Design a protein around this ligand. Sequence first.
Ligand SMILES: O=C(Oc1c(Br)cc(Br)cc1CNC(=O)c1ccccc1[N+](=O)[O-])c1ccccc1Cl
Ligand SMILES: O=C(Oc1c(Br)cc(Br)cc1CNC(=O)c1ccccc1[N+](=O)[O-])c1ccccc1Cl
Lengths: 163, 168
Amino acid sequence: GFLELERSSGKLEWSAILQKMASDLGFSKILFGLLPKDSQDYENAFIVGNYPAAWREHYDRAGYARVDPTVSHCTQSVLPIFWEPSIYQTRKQHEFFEEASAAGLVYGLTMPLHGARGELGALSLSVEAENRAEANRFMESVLPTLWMLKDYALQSGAGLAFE
Amino acid sequence: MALVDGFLELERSSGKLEWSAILQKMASDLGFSKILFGLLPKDSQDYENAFIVGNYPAAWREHYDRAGYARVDPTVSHCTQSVLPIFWEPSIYQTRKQHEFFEEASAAGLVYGLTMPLHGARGELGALSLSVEAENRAEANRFMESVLPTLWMLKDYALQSGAGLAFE
Ligand SMILES: O=C(Oc1c(Br)cc(Br)cc1CNC(=O)c1ccccc1[N+](=O)[O-])c1ccccc1Cl
Ligand SMILES: O=C(Oc1c(Br)cc(Br)cc1CNC(=O)c1ccccc1[N+](=O)[O-])c1ccccc1Cl
C-alpha cells in the first residue's frame, strides 16, 4: 500500500504522502503527471510533486513536452526510460538536459503511466548522486519497489485527477 | 542493469511458440505453475478471440470460451477498472455464478494465484494470470508476497513485448 494515499483527501495530502514515499526510498525530487483519455494537452496536465516551481513554469513556457525525450517514450512504452546521456539526441534535447540539470534534475528515470481508462502519465523521480554510475547503482537497488509504486500512484491519482 | 537482463529474452524471441516457451519458463523458474497471458487490442471486448499464451489446460480454455466465463470472471471486470493485482481469494467470487466459476476453475487445478491487469501504451487490454501450487492459501500467499516485486516488473515486460507479437 497505498494505505495512506487512499485514506488521504485532497491533492495537498496526496502529494505529501507520495513525496515522502519517494524520499524514504532515496529520491529527492518527483513529478507525477497525468492526462485523461485522448488528451495531448501537456501544458494542462494534472501535476503533483516537488520539482522546483520555476522549472515547471519554464518547462511549460518553452514547450519542452515537444523536446523532452521521456514524453514520446511514454506514448510508446510501459517500461521505464532512464535519464541516460544517449536519450538526449538533438541540440534542443542537449539544452533541455542542461536546463533540467541547472534545476538540479540530472539523474533519474521516468516511469510511463497507462491507466485502466486510457489515462496517460509519467512518474519521474530524480536522485542526488556524485556521478551517474552512483545514481544507476542506487536506482537498480530500488527498481522493483519503484515499479510497484508507480502503479499504486497511477491507480490512486487517476481518481483524484479526473473523478 | 543485471536486474532486468533475464527479461531481455522476451524481445529476442522469434514467433509465438518461442515467446510462450520463454514466458512459461520465467514463471515456472519464479515458482508459479500455470500461466495465461491474454491480450486484446484497443476498444475490443472480444475475449473469445483474444491473443492467448500459456499452459492452462486446453479443455479449460475451451470451456471458458464456451461457457462465456469472461462475463462473470471477477478478474476480467477488475482488469477493466485497475492496474493493480487481484489475488484469487474466496472473497472475489461473490455471485452464485462466480462461485460456479471458482468451482470449475478449481477442478482445472487453478485455485491459488493472482491476475495482473495489463494496459498497454496503445490501448491494449490484457491480463497475466499465474497459478500457485501450495498446501493452503496462507502458504500460497506467503510465496506470492515473496516474488511480487519481480512479478510486477515481469508483467510489464511481458506486456510490452507481447503487444508487439500480437498486433505489431
Ligand atoms: O508529466 C509529464 O511530463 C512532464 C511535464 Br507535463 C512537466 C515536467 Br516539469 C516534466 C515532465 C516529465 N519530464 C521529466 O520529469 C524529466 C525527464 C527527464 C529529464 C528531466 C526531466 N525534468 O526535469 O522535467 C508527462 C509525460 C508523459 C505523459 C504525460 C505526462 Cl502529464
Ligand atoms: O485473458 C483474459 O481472460 C481470460 C480468458 Br480470455 C481465458 C481464460 Br481460460 C482465463 C482468463 C482470465 N482468468 C483467469 O486466468 C482466472 C482468474 C482467476 C481464477 C481462475 C482463472 N482461470 O483459471 O480462468 C483477459 C482478462 C482481462 C482482459 C483481457 C483479457 Cl484477454
